[PDB]
């Protein structure tokens, strides 16, 4: 009867944490944000349509110049576009046709990809010899690579379907540290602006906050009902949003250790694939499976407008790192850039 | 102006080359026919792929590109990665026949089949059904210690259909059981009734004739019925 006493003490501990969190709830952001003026019906229009793909787009990423963007599709092609003049700077054929993720280096050097082939392939773009070659291929997961992002040009963190996260180093090619403690598939992650720590979504409806240098989980947030598809930080780093398959977006604060607010509406039955903020931190953009992109407000929770468009589900969403535009990938192979 | 114009011309040529090669890629790509091989557990799905990593297999018949993918290297928490395959023309679903006794992974396989058939993104993908381990099924049934009727009582009420194609040297009960499993998979497929996708059963590997020929005929059928139904002739 050891497992019983252990589970009892664990449940009790959980209860104490629940109550300690419930005690900090003296007001709501919904209560105090009454005086803040609303957004108004402020709408975007398609300034550019980037078409080049044969199959469905699974992901994209903006570069730090806000100019280039990488997009990967399930045909095994990786296209590096240019936002202004709608060209194609590079096309890199992949080894595996199926690719679920892509990432951009902050200095513009490397481009990463990954998918059901379990291996995170790093591609160099600065080759004086010419075209692109596989620079370093990183393999340590027993499951598919769901997402990954560059810390810098040297070390890169990955998320996977073997329940774990791992921080790699490109030069040795090994795992510097291994993050375990999630329950199901780790669907997505987002770094910090100061990159000391990063959150992750999982299939147990709980987002965890880890610390990159030490490797430990500081806080576990359980607010959603089903699988968390995407997670994105806030401009100052003190909050983050998670989309899920419970058709709700939620805002969580790190210093409050609990879910502050839920954005939902009753006419939604389908999941949220992707989220992001703007430059200022006022707008929360979310793609859904009802083929639209709903633009919510971060303070008043009323949708200011909507983004029409894609004929099938929206897989990915990104915002330029100066906040100049928004980009939405779908399963109809088309990218739409908005303003 | 002075050198941005050259950038335009450089990027133009790069765009041309990429555009060209990409156009050459579209032909082979769209001509390639993608297939998803999956099986529940102890399914004999490693034999067909014996008939890139170890996962992926591209095999060629009659100058018609087939590109199979095996998912055997992943965990069985399936609901996130199976959405990645909605363009695959057919899902080859291979199930063992004598696993009714011990557990009942035959019932598990049936469950998985129903789940795939009703899944909201995979409402367009026809399932080619391979019923495997025919001789082994026959052995277990004639041995009789392992009774199907324990795990399927309604088998007592199901008799041999009118379209029976008996091969000689076989128990009519064994044949009836065989057709009963086949019908158990068919009725699930006929429950939807929209006719967007169909399940083609087969019997396999008691005779080791090349099941690619069946795969061939059925793939032809799937695409032919796609155009046929879209043109409202069906």
């Amino acid at each position, epitope marked *: 009867s050891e497992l019983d006493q252990l589970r009892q003490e664990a449940e009790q501990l959980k209860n104490q944490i629940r109550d300690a969190r419930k005690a900090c709830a003296d007001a709501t952001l919904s209560q105090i944000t009454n005086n803040i003026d609303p957004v108004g019906r402020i709408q975007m229009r398609t300034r550019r349509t980037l078409r080049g793909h044969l199959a469905k787009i699974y992901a994209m990423h903006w570069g730090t110049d806000s100019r280039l963007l990488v997009s990967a599709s399930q045909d095994g092609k990786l296209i590096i576009w240019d936002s202004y003049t709608t060209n194609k700077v590079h096309a890199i054929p992949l080894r595996s046709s199926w690719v679920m993720t892509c990432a951009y280096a902050p200095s513009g050097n490397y481009v990463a990809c990954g998918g059901l082939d379990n291996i995170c392939s790093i591609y160099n773009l600065k080759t004086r010899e010419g075209n692109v070659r596989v620079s370093r291929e990183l393999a340590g997961h027993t499951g598919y690579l769901s997402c990954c992002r560059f810390l810098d040009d040297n070390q890169i963190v990955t998320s996977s379907g073997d329940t774990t996260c791992a921080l790699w180093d490109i030069e040795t090619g090994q795992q510097t540290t291994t993050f375990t403690g999630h329950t199901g598939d780790v669907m997505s992650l987002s770094l910090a602006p100061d990159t000391r720590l990063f959150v992750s979504g999982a*299939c147990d409806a709980s987002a965890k906050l880890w610390d990159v240098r030490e490797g430990m989980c500081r806080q576990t947030f359980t607010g959603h*009902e089903s699988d968390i598809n995407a997670i994105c930080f806030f401009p100052n780093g003190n909050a983050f949003a998670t989309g899920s*398959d419970d058709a709700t977006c939620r805002l969580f604060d790190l210093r409050a250790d609990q879910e502050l607010m839920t954005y939902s509406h009753d006419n939604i039955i389908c999941g949220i694939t992707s989220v992001s903020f703007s430059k200022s931190g006022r707008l929360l953009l979310a793609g859904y499976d009802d083929f639209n992109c709903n633009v919510w407000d971060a303070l008043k929770a009323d949708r200011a407008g909507v983004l029409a468009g894609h004929d099938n589900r929206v897989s990915c969403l990104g915002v330029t790192d100066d906040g100049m535009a928004v980009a939405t990938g779908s399963w109809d192979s088309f990218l739409k850039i908005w303003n | 102006t002075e050198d941005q114009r050259n950038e335009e011309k450089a990027q133009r040529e790069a765009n041309k080359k990429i555009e060209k090669q990409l156009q050459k890629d579209k032909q082979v790509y769209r001509a390639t026919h993608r297939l998803l091989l999956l099986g529940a557990g102890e399914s004999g799905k490693s034999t067909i792929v014996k008939q890139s990593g170890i996962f992926e297999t591209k095999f060629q018949v009659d100058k018609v590109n087939f590109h199979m993918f095996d998912v055997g290297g992943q965990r069985d928490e*399936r609901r996130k990665w199976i959405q990645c395959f909605n363009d695959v023309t057919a899902i080859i679903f291979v199930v063992a026949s004598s696993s009714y006794n011990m557990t009942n992974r035959l019932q*598990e396989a049936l*469950n998985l089949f129903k789940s*795939i058939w009703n*899944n909201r993104w995979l409402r367009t993908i026809s399932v080619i059904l391979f019923l495997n381990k025919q001789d082994l099924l026959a052995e277990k049934v004639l041995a009789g210690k392992s009774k199907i009727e324990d795990y399927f*009582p309604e088998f007592a009420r199901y008799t041999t259909p009118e379209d029976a194609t008996p091969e000689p040297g076989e128990d009519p009960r064994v044949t009836r059981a065989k057709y009963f499993i086949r019908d158990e998979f068919l009725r699930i497929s006929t429950a939807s009734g929209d006719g967007r996708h169909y399940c083609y059963p087969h019997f396999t590997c008691a005779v080791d004739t090349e099941n690619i020929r069946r795969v061939f005929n059925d793939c032809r059928d799937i695409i032919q019925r796609m155009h046929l139904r879209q043109y409202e002739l069906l």
Partner: nanobody
Amino acid sequence: QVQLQESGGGLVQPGGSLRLSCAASGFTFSNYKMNWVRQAPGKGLEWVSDISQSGASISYTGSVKGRFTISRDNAKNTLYLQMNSLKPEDTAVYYCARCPAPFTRDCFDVTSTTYAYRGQGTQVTVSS
């Protein structure tokens, strides 16, 4: 958070009856397809019975046709499994697991542990 607590269960004579209950909370219980999944001692799991949103669509594994009655109470967020006329093959741990997706017909749950939408289970054992 999400938890599903298996209650009931215990040592009962074969041919007897036992009513399994599952109390759910933390989610809008009305929408989610619930089902009962078992794990036999020393053998892998097998799905047993499911119940749909409205309480209409109900399937059983063929071994337990009709003698098991699954009923849902949406009015207070609680689930019920009525077992009648037990068999010696029924002795196992009965978990109540929900299907992960809202508003659907498909489920992927018999897949083994560290799946969060499943409870700890109760012990049902067939008497001697």
